[PDB]
Design a protein around this ligand. Structure first.
Ligand SMILES: [Ca+2]
Ligand SMILES: [Cl-]
Length: 325
């Protein structure tokens, strides 16, 4: 059943909690699919709260985004304030994080973006020791490693998914496979130097992009991000292709929106390790606003989520075992 999936994380001496989380996911492979929601933008669990108000159940995994490194610390975003992550973990939920790596729109700008169409930041220069771009990404990694170390010191592991969708060539890190792989290894080695042993590394594949794969030494789980795909058969075809490319690794639907209901996906063979719905900015940015209660959602509405939780294979937060002690 799951004998092909690797038993060990790529990180030597990974934390007890990271190993427990990974081992649980490995045990679920082919049998269960975890539910997950994205934060509203970055640093909250507003979509998890929204899902509970629609269904009575919470998602198993809450994901956060370190996108706003340039502004942190600020009145409105401070990644040193880890209570929102701590509180989720202590309520028994799993913690995930991604990272829209925002860089100056142009040299000396005060605007920060991540799409190639919105920044001229050049990864090839960022990898050359001593350049302006290199100093920028080193300082970002130092700041980010410090924020992640706050979670490590609280014994909170993170299902960590940086540098995603590289081969789509729409983010500044998607210029070319060779420089992309060098950047992934720099992030990994920088974090290793900082002592971050609480991370499970998720590499997001666009399918048929093996030239972009950073390597077994730097990756634990494969992710796929899919929007606007309502053929469950097509979703299963993607799932199968990823399983074939990476037969030793769990495969997750790490982002989705406007996709076939989970019952159809599962019946077609798309047996993802988890699915994470993207956020609807206007609906969940304010949990006190009337729109919070309506049930409509750009990515997965009330009916979609009640369908998902109606399926035997789908895990909610209260289904999870304990990952602490
Ligand atoms: Ca900062
Ligand atoms: Cl629950």
């Amino acid at each position: 059943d799951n004998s092909l999936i690797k038993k060990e994380l790529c990180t030597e001496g990974a934390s007890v909690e990271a190993k427990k989380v990974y081992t649980y996911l490995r045990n679920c492979w082919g049998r269960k699919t975890l539910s997950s929601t994205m934060a509203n933008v970055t640093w909250n669990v507003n979509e998890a709260i929204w899902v509970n108000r629609q269904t009575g159940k919470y998602p198993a995994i809450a994901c956060f985004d370190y996108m706003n490194l340039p502004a942190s610390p600020a009145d409105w975003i401070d990644y040193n304030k880890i209570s929102v992550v701590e509180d989720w973990w202590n309520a028994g939920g799993l913690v995930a994080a991604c990272w829209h790596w925002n860089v100056p729109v142009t040299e000396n700008s005060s605007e920060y973006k991540c799409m190639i169409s919105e920044t001229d930041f050049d990864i090839t220069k960022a990898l050359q020791e001593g350049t302006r771009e290199n100093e920028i990404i080193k300082a970002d990694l130092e700041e980010l490693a410090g924020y992640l170390l706050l979670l490590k010191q609280k014994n909170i592991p993170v299902i960590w998914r940086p540098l995603h969708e590289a081969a789509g060539k729409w983010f500044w890190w998607g210029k070319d496979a060779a420089s992309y792989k060098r950047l992934w290894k720099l992030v990994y080695e920088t974090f290793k130097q900082k002592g971050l042993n609480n991370l499970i590394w998720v590499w997001t594949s666009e399918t048929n992009d093996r030239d972009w794969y950073p390597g077994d030494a730097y990756v634990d789980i494969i992710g796929r991000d899919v929007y606007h795909k309502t053929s469950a058969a097509g979703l299963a075809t993607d799932f199968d292709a990823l399983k074939k490319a990476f037969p030793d690794k769990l495969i997750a639907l790490s982002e989705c929106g406007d996709v076939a209901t989970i019952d159809k996906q599962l019946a077609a063979g798309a047996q993802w390790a988890w699915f994470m719905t993207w956020y609807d900015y206007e609906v969940t940015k304010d949990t006190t606003a009337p729109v919070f209660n309506s049930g409509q959602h750009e990515h997965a509405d009330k009916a979609w989520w009640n369908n998902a939780f109606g399926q035997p294979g789908v895990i909610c937060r209260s289904d999870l075992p304990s990952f602490k002690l």
